[PDB]
Scaffold this active site. Structure first.
Site: not given
Ligand SMILES: [Zn+2]
Length: 324
Positions: A28, A274
């Site tokens: 990500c 993330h």
């Protein structure tokens, strides 16, 4: 899809495609920066135009990828960037694992690499030095002066950048952080005093880029914990931002910017976390969370300033486009 549904068929842009990228496990840091770049229109155009024109590189994969998206039949969807991520792992071995990476190392690796791919390329047109289209979009220039405090001698030397990294502190603004950037520091040898001497070093922005990629340095080594921490400080950033250069050129003292993309980091440390991207497209904003794509409200950007108060959602790289 509910994405089109929520933009509205009236507000949904002509020939625009909104496609998520699949996480392949801690990828990500790559997706979010990829989305951010895709929504830097000068950049999207140069790379689309590259696909049109050749030996396999990071850039061909990017171009294949951006092309793949901008060519998609449907208006909304999801693409696995398998080939790009493989090429990236094959090419840079510091990313060839399943550990989380630093989105800013990626961005910076990507631009540097795409830069001198295109250097070695126009070194193959001239002679079958001349600033690349990567540089055209992202390159800025700073001068770091140094004054010998003894004799007051200033030594300048420029350096070019493709991104700018600033230090953060609690309850501040991007503006405060850029100002801190030009702030004096104090182990020197000047050719004038010819001894080693004590000095004042400064950094000034000589040339502002057409797209300012602004890295907030939220992962600092904390001398206490004997570890890297994520600084979750509240750092506000404006949607529009007027910046100044130290060029002295009275006809170009200036550059006006609009925020087009934010890479935000979610979590409480540089290993557990993330990444997502907030991007501007025409009159609205989109959040890309790997495969999930959804409309966000511009007032909700302020969610990503960070806390005054462990885990948080903070802006990490800001992308400001000039109106120039
Ligand atoms: Zn001196």
């Amino acid at each position: 899809s509910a994405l089109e549904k929520e933009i509205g068929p009236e507000q949904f842009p002509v020939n625009e495609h909104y496609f998520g990228l699949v996480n392949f496990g801690n990828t990500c840091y790559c997706n979010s920066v990829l989305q951010a770049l895709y929504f830097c229109r000068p950049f999207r155009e140069k790379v689309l135009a590259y696909k049109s024109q050749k030996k396999e590189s990071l850039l061909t994969c990017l171009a294949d990828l951006f092309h793949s998206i901008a060519t998609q039949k449907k208006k909304v969807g999801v693409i696995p960037p398998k080939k790009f991520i493989t090429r990236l792992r094959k090419e840079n071995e510091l990313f060839d694992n399943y550990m989380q990476q630093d989105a800013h190392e990626f961005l910076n690796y990507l631009l540097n690499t795409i830069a001198d791919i295109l250097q070695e390329e126009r070194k193959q047109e001239k002679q079958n030095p001349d600033p690349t289209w990567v540089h055209e979009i992202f390159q800025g220039t700073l001068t770091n002066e140094t004054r010998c405090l003894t004799c007051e001698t200033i030594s300048s030397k420029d350096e070019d950048f493709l991104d700018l990294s600033v230090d953060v502190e609690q309850n501040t603004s991007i503006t405060h952080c850029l100002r801190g950037f030009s702030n004096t520091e104090t182990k020197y040898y000047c050719e004038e005093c010819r001894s080693k001497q004590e000095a004042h070093k400064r950094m000034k922005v000589k040339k502002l880029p057409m797209i300012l990629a602004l890295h907030l340095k939220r992962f600092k080594y904390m001398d206490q914990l004997h570890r890297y921490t994520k600084l979750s400080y509240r750092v506000v950033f404006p949607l529009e931002l007027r910046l100044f250069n130290t060029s002295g050129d009275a006809t170009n003292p200036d550059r006006m910017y609009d925020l087009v993309a934010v890479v935000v980091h979610c979590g409480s440390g540089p290993n557990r976390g993330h990444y997502i991207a907030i991007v501007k497209s025409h009159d609205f904003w989109l959040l890309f969370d790997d495969d999930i794509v959804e409309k966000i409200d511009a007032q909700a950007i302020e969610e990503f300033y960070g806390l005054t108060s462990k885990n948080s959602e903070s802006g990490y790289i800001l992308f400001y486009q000039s109106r120039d």
